[PDB]
């Protein structure tokens, strides 16, 4: 429409005039703010066979102060985009402004609680608030479009603009058109795509004003019940998605912009390990192959890598981890079987252009397979090849089912297997069988075994096929040549030659076979062996793989290795692999160019041997050095009391007065004399403190108070130094009505009620019109019994300066309102030289909040990727306490003893300095009158990986400096 690089028709996108199946993964830059680790993820996605990444930008992190857009240092998108280019990954840009994303505010900054208008509407007040963010983010995105030689190919305005309520005329075409025009005005010319929350046709092509270019929708068919990871409920596998597609947007390629790749987990939930069990390899092979049955042309997995909700960036229902049970773990590892299984499907799609041109039919329980226990969805092509998606009709069935097929081919319709026996489908599995499959001029008449990849080399063609354990398979090839077994046993392989073909039956074995048929070699593998193969692009013009274009796709080699193969390139007589190893690994290379004499692995010349089939073999030795980690309990811990407010000497004259008579919040009108909503005063994040001054009459009995912090929040209350009590919190409570009994008060004396409240993050805004992101934080109601409420005069604080936030490097959400945070003592080199020596393992003996500081050195070896974790013990039922941990000033753990479930907090290299000094700052809030303490505090590691990654540069870690605007 507006450019010629990215076009489309009814079947697929075209990139530079060439069809492409977009297989993508969701990855949020703000959840992993270390540039070199961003490259790591990109390279791990490219190794799946993927060609694209989808990303959100969080507005709340980059416009914390209204009118000051800051996307610099750790929030800079440019290194993220350059890393995408370098890895060979296209991008789908999704800057919002609304992103949902289990993020604070759904991406909206807290100052939107002061906007006089419906959020996500055509109300001028809301739209004007978005203009500065969008003109900055979209101009940056504009500079990195594919039209300007960048990686960005698609843009998403808004997010799941799908349900409205409460007097909003949904869907508002004036709204979606304005949001679209914003992007275009900033120079975005690539196609716009939407992500309808269900397949409802909203803003599709043909709907007039506010229509996007490509209609997309999202789908989370297996749901979020991570507690029952083996239960696949009846009818939850979608079957009508093609039917809906043809009703809703038949002129554009079929697109699912967020397809389930994991699950969220709330405070108190079963944990993300459970989520990875639900959204595991079996889920992938059934549910993703099912999306291929609808001829999906654009497919993005939410999430491929989740990362971490550091510095309070997350929404109140979620905790620090955003692992998400995704194929790449929060600590960046790719050990989960779901990664390897996904690699098999992504590589198949990468080399199968006939998939895009075929004609999809409706699913059938007869015609193709000889039992109604199986479903077969055909995608039939007129000589470009066909594809048959086989699964159990009862999609959850764990039964083993025998069958035969009738499939139409160019050489007649054939009953398979021709040479005796039956095919098998074992439980929760799905197969993509193929017919007339083009391997660079060689025609595979059919194969029941699934294609992993194929390549044309100088010295012939190679095809890689796999099946699961215990299965019999059959293939047939258009040829005059004979079949011979060139590796492995002749036994178990049957064959038959006709005038224009050869048929070959084989049983799956753990031992690889290789057959040869003319100029085609075919690898016959079990699934588990196929897990260890990789298909990196072979660069000849440099070291980078480049994008997945037809040329560079064809110029790829096949590599059997272990943990990871990142890249390959040819330079003179050297073949250079870059790869990662988590054990001693046999490396085979198939397709070595004839000019290559030597093998290099991560720069090191490695001795190799060529076998009788031309395969290079070499071993890479794995010998991890000593990984020596400090004992955290034995550090020189320094303590300062971070609730000096409850001392009677405390002077709060510099605090903001909570004296606004009228709230700017349109969702909830005031039920107190003045606004005690934190966001009215610029305070959107971390712990909030309120101080209520009053003069006692001497008749005061009780103080009741309604505090609100979001799900799982806690609050504590003191009268001068007298602890009154705490709401210890529950996931079920986002507010709580407390009643406290006061001690006997002295008439005419002044007293101060100090209230500490955990702000868990701002709410999302999923339904347009409900304005739920405006749900306030702080004090909603109070009652000093027998006194008017104007008796109490309130002050409050959140993070120092509120929207004029101090720490421009670490962002507007990172720190909260505690004394130690306000002064900046959570940063490297605090002024702790005259503080008391005490450990958080000794802790507190009364209700209160302690702040603990210590440094520790690491000297971990270069060329090793070693995942590190902070561990807080919970071996027995604890007293109620809350902990934050800052690592060189960055908050990387929020811990609630009594709710959980997280005890293990990964912290990435770049935040941690692996060859240098590191600073821990721990806040310990004891919500109990006897105090509280940590049971244990430990640094640990998991399997070191011999890595190809370059030096991870430490992010900016500004040291402590006295802050002029502090309250002391
Ligand atoms: C270095 O990096 C590597 C990555 O490159 C990394 O390797 C990967 O490690 C992960 C673990 O982190 C692996 O994932 C697990 O795999 C388990 C094993 O099963 C898989 O493999 C077998 C094949 O096993 C043989 O071969 C291998 C390889 O040669 C050997 O190592 C084995 O020892 C074994 O050898 C025997 O057999 C050979 C021939 O077959 C013989 O030659 C040999 O002599 C031996 O006799 C396959 O059979 C499995 O397939 C079957 O099962 C799967 C999954 O159920 C089905 O989908 C499939 O259709 C088949 O039926 C399978 O591929 C898995 O058991 C394990 O699965 C569990 O965990 C995940 C969650 O992570 C769940 O999704 C899943 O549901 C399973 O959950 C159970 O277990 C968890 C506890 O962990 C419970 O929470 C849960 O409730 C559940 O328990 C219940 O069910 C169990 C049955 O499943 C039951 O036993 C329990 O008692 C209970 O009832 C998981 O997927 C991954 O495969 C590796 N990847 C690769 C490429 O190798 C390596 O570890 C790294 N190294 C280090 C040090 O870090
Ligand atoms: C890939 O990336 C992943 C994400 O980054 C990463 O996964 C995370 O890994 C960390 C570290 O391993 C996990 O934290 C640990 O979890 C342990 C508890 O979970 C286990 O318990 C269940 C019941 O047995 C298992 O079923 C469960 O399996 C599930 O989870 C797996 C997740 O990978 C999955 O593969 C499985 O399929 C399945 O779904 C799980 O294995 C927990 O025990 C552990 O705490 C101990 O270790 C810490 C140090 O690392 C200590 O600080 C801590 O105090 C604990 O040590 C104590 O207890 C041990 C067991 O008794 C003893 O061996 C220790 O000596 C020590 O003992 C002292 O304390 C005892 C009190 O209990 C006392 O009795 C003793 O006397 C003594 O005083 C830790 O929290 C984290 O949960 C994972 N996160 C996610 C999201 O999964 C994965 O590792 C990465 N992989 C690679 C290869 O890199
Ligand atoms: C240290 O170790 C200790 C000791 O073992 C750990 O303490 C345990 O921690 C558990 C987790 O916090 C805690 O269990 C919880 O107890 C509460 C009741 O007090 C209960 O509400 C919890 O169950 C719900 O919530 C979780 C998520 O937090 C869900 O996964 C679960 O399915 C339940 O969800 C239901 O309620 C939610 C609340 O709104 C709903 O959002 C959700 O949709 C669902 O609703 C259904 O039920 C409602 C009625 O409940 C109904 O109205 C609605 O219509 C739906 O039907 C969970 O059981 C243990 O109590 C606690 N044990 C002890 C002895 O103290 C501690 O966590 C550890 N610490 C760390 C850091 O690991
Ligand atoms: O990361 C969470 C993810 O949630 C997305 O909400 C998605 C979607 O969920 C549907 O619910 C599933 C349900 O869990 C299944 O049990 C079964 O019923 O299928 C349903 C889908 O039809 C909701 O019903 C649907 O409204 C929608 O909420 C969120 O949209 C996404 O941004 C992301 O946050
Ligand atoms: C919002 O706008 C209306 C428009 O009539 C105005 O009268 C009022 O001052 C504003 N209200 C709030 C709560 O901000
Ligand atoms: C396939 O599509 C529809 C919807 O599933 C089905 O009713 C019909 O029988 C099939 N189409 C034709 C032309 O037979
Ligand atoms: C098979 O692939 C070759 C390119 O290697 C192409 O020229 C040819 O047209 C293809 N044949 C079919 C039938 O698609
Ligand atoms: C309570 O605290 C305030 C200052 O926080 C102090 O001025 C006042 O004297 C204290 N009241 C009593 C009774 O000690
Ligand atoms: C406060 O005064 C009331 C009567 O007005 C009396 O009932 C109560 O006991 C008094 N003292 C308290 C609450 O300490
Ligand atoms: C607390 O009381 C307020 C005011 O009556 C009410 O709106 C709210 O529902 C109550 N909250 C809880 C958690 O019971
Ligand atoms: Cl201060």
Q: Count of DSSP helices?
A: 13
Q: Tell me the fraction of residues in β-strands, as a range.
A: 25-35%
Please give the order of strands in the largest beta sheet: 11-12-13-18-19-22-25-24
By CATH reckoning, the class of the largest domain would read: Alpha Beta
Q: What's the overall geometry?
A: globular
User: In the CATH classification, which architecture of the largest domain applies?
Assistant: Alpha-Beta Barrel
Radius of gyration: 30 Å
Bound molecules: a molecule of 10 linked components (NAG-NAG-BMA-MAN-MAN-MAN-MAN-MAN-...), a molecule of 8 linked components (NAG-NAG-BMA-MAN-MAN-MAN-MAN-MAN), a molecule of 6 linked components (NAG-NAG-BMA-MAN-MAN-MAN), a molecule of 3 linked components (GLC-GAL-GAL), 2-acetamido-2-deoxy-beta-D-glucopyranose, chloride ion
Task: Provide the structure class.
Answer: mainly beta
Strand count, sense and closure of the main sheet? 8 strands, antiparallel
Q: End-to-end distance, in Å? A: 60 Å
How many distinct domains? 5
Q: CATH superfamily membership of the largest domain, which one?
A: Glycosidases
Helix content: 10-25%
- CATH topology term of the largest domain: TIM Barrel
Family: Belongs to the glycosyl hydrolase 35 family.
Binding site for substrate: 56, 100-102, 159, 324
Function: Cleaves beta-linked terminal galactosyl residues from gangliosides, glycoproteins, and glycosaminoglycans.
Main location: secreted
